[PDB]
Amino acid sequence: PSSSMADFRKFFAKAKHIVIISGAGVSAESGVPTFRGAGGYWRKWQAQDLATPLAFAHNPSRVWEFYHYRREVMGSKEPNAGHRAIAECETRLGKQGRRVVVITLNIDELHRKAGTKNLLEIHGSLFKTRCTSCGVVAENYKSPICPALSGKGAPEPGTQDASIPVEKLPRCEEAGCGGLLRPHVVWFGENLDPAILEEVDRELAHCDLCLVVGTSSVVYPAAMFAPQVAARGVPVAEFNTETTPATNRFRFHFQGPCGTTLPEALA
Amino acid sequence: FSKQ
Ligand SMILES: Nc1ncnc2c1ncn2[C@@H]1O[C@H](COP(=O)(O)OP(=O)(O)O)[C@@H](O)[C@H]1O
Ligand SMILES: [Zn+2]
Asked: Which of A220, A224, A228, A244 to mutate against chain B (most B CBs within 10 Å)?
């Protein structure tokens, strides 16, 4: 794929509808822990252990401790230069009647914190709950989400499980439900929301320029978004610290940290 | 579709 910042800028200068797909590489530059990489662990588990229907079916207290810890550390995390360039770009182009939309696999909301308004969070949010009984989704920023989680979630190896009785985990406050809440996060093996996928499809079908920033392009169906864009002939530009299995299918590959390359690209 |  092409390495020419010059040529990308010529496309960028003319684009009227830009889609930006963002993955964990954008969050990682803010020091947000993914618990995904080699050695990237919570106590004795990684996300593939605890971010699953299985985990929550076996030990919902431990899954909540993990998500409580992740919610809490977000208080010490801020958007990076990549989030900021993306947010500033949407604002500058919006004034010009040009559309920028972010499709993110990230659940940390840092795109929002940076000011992005046109956002599609396809994997949900650390700061949303869903009731396992009635299905209602709510925003929730409370630290701690419930009193039984106060001071829990510590990540050090050997930390004892809080073993909170499920009645003392976060509970649906909808009149008459009181069911058990889970994080409104898409876990491995779960389907994405068809309503959200419909919105994603609308942006993919109408955009004229597409950026894929900080994703390995192995998580599906997100790994297929940029290919159906290039099919129309639309330029796809990949911003990653390393090549991915999808690199050779893109018009541009700009190697390096997103927070280093994105400000130049979106300038 | 499902998350990989
Ligand atoms: N600082 C960074 N800037 C751009 N890309 C990064 C950065 N750090 C990591 N990456 C890349 O982001 C991807 C992370 O993979 P993964 O954890 O599977 O995230 P996702 O599920 O969002 O694809 C890999 O390509 C990784 O090398
Ligand atoms: Zn409910």
From this structure: A220
